[PDB]
Amino acid sequence: NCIEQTTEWSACSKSCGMGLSTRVTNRNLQCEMVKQTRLCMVRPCE
Amino acid sequence: NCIEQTTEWSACSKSCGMGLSTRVTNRNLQCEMVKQTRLCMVRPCE
């Protein structure tokens, strides 16, 4: 069967500049785990 | 010297189910080309 699984969006992968925030989810018709990523920036690098 | 460049979102990497669509952009403080990715679904699979 299918049991829903979605993680929280991660902290930004980099402490300065552009990094990624990542989660995983099976919220799709095949109920398979996939990754999602979004750009993030905590602060600019000096 | 920075010339803005953002490509078109690509066709979905898979013909059914969850695939990925990608583009590249330098819209960031370093003016560096970075990839962006998004889940896509053309149609459900069998």
Ligand SMILES: [Cl-]
């Ligand atoms: Cl569930």
Ligand SMILES: [Cl-]
């Ligand atoms: Cl979250």
Ligand SMILES: [Cl-]
């Ligand atoms: Cl993004």
Ligand SMILES: [Cl-]
């Ligand atoms: Cl586009």
Ligand SMILES: [Cl-]
């Ligand atoms: Cl996505």
Ligand SMILES: [Cl-]
């Ligand atoms: Cl599907």
Ligand code: NA
């Ligand atoms: Na749940």
Ligand code: NA
């Ligand atoms: Na959850």
Ligand code: NA
């Ligand atoms: Na992404």
